[PDB]
Amino acid sequence: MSPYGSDTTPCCFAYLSLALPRAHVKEYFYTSSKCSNLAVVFVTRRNRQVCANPEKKWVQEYINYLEMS
């Protein structure tokens, strides 16, 4: 437990019109609530995370695909 919650917080704002194939992605995640902008963090099969804003339809498609698969 950390009594002091004023620590390093993962935040991000990015997007990509050409998203990596769904076969390379493992799952999706959302940026910290501390972030002024809510973004989606895709975790690849290589466990490498990337940030993309949910307003991109590809992100929606990938989220919709990863939520069902």
The reply on whether position 12 binds its own copies by CB under 8 A is yes
The reply on whether position 5 binds its own copies by CB under 8 A is yes
The reply on whether position 6 binds its own copies by CB under 8 A is yes
What span, in angstroms and rounded, lies between the C-alpha atoms of 13 and 44? 18
Two structure tokens written together for 68: 């069902």
What span, in angstroms and rounded, lies between the C-alpha atoms of 12 and 28? 14
User: Nearer to its own copies by C-beta: 11 or 63?
Assistant: 11
**Helix, strand or coil, per DSSP, at residue 44:** strand
The reply on whether position 9 binds its own copies by CB under 8 A is yes
The reply on whether position 51 binds its own copies by CB under 8 A is yes
